Amino acid sequence: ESQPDPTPDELHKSSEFTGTMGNMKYLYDDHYVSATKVMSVDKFLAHDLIYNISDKKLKNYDKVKTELLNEDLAKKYKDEVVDVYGSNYYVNCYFSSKDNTGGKTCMYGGITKHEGNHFDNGNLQNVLIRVYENKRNTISFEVQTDKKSVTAQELDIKARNFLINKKNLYEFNSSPYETGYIKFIENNGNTFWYDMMPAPGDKFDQSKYLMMYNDNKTVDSKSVKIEVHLTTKNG
């Protein structure tokens, strides 16, 4: 559990990344994979599961490989009926069986068991997010989930998705914010955060970024606290 908060000279600065924040934008703007009661159909490497998940929308994929931190986590979820929710990328994505193209996408984590994970009533405790702009708490909004034990990733995607649209969190060129991290605070005081900005240099490696989600970290939707901490660029 508990991991400190960000050190100043540690956080990523958008002015140090120089290769289309749009490429970072693609991952959170109305972009994700959602599966309702799927069981692993196959596996490429020891730590991943391949689900036969079709593109409910415009069919860009029929196979989703999601990687987990290791084989012990993969063991635990293979055989299980699961609801899936993550962010995908095609870029540097896999090579399954050699025995069967149009419809191969990748993910990290995003697995939740279907049995006992939904509320008796609708989208419950639909989680509140406190946003901080230059230390000040300026806006607060609610994202909603339907699972009692949801992945940190799901709340992250929905959080950023809102931030992109109403706060222009990410532009296609660069970003109005220099730094930013999303901090999750659990009922027990467990604290853990993710950096929202890309590593320095031109290009952005999507798979290396999303990789932080492979631990398959879940939280409780009734009790989790989320605060995102941004900072503006000067002019």
Q: Which string of x and - marks every residue 38-77 that binds Zn ion (by CB under 5 A)?
A: ----------------------------------------
When computed from its CA atoms, the radius of gyration of the chain, rounded to whole angstroms, is: 18
Pick the binder of Zn ion from 48, 83, 154, 156 (CB under 5 A): 83
Inter-residue contact 64 to 50 (CB < 8 Å):
yes
- 134: alpha, beta or left? (left if phi > 0; alpha if psi -120 to 50): left
The answer to whether the annotation marks 62 as part of a ligand binding site is no
**How many angstroms separate the CA atoms of 27 and 16, rounded?**
20
The answer to whether the annotation marks 67 as part of a ligand binding site is no
Kindly report the backbone phi and psi dihedral angles of residue 144, in degrees, each rounded to the nearest multiple of 5, phi listed first.
-125, 150
**How many angstroms separate the CA atoms of 1 and 199, rounded?**
25
The answer to whether the annotation marks 71 as part of a ligand binding site is yes
Q: For the purposes of burial, counting CB atoms within 10 Å of the CB of 139, is it exposed (0-12), middle (13-18) or buried (19 or more)? A: middle
Q: Which is nearer to Zn ion, 37 or 233 (CB)?
A: 37
Pick the binder of Zn ion from 13, 31, 78, 114 (CB under 5 A): 114
The answer to whether the annotation marks 178 as part of a ligand binding site is no
The answer to whether the annotation marks 1 as part of a ligand binding site is no
**How many angstroms separate the CA atoms of 187 and 223, rounded?**
6
The region of 15-23, 71-79, 81-89, 100-108 touching Zn ion under the rule CB under 5 A is 81-89
Q: Is 148 in the site for Zn ion (CB under 5 A)?
A: no
**How many angstroms separate the CA atoms of 181 and 193, rounded?**
7
The answer to whether the annotation marks 80 as part of a ligand binding site is yes
Beta carbon of residue 91, minimum distance to Zn ion (angstroms, whole number): 29
71 vs 51, 67, 77, 87, 231, CA distance in Å? 16, 10, 10, 21, 38
Place of tokens 């008796």: 120
Beta carbon of residue 148, minimum distance to Zn ion (angstroms, whole number): 11
Q: Which is nearer to Zn ion, 112 or 214 (CB)?
A: 112
Q: Which is nearer to Zn ion, 116 or 235 (CB)?
A: 116
Beta carbon of residue 124, minimum distance to Zn ion (angstroms, whole number): 14
Per the document, the length of the chain is 235
Q: Which is nearer to Zn ion, 13 or 114 (CB)?
A: 114
Beta carbon of residue 37, minimum distance to Zn ion (angstroms, whole number): 6
Binding positions for Zn(2+) are: 9, 47, 71, 80, 83, 114-115, 118
Which residues form the interface with Zn ion (CB under 5 A)?
A: 83, 114
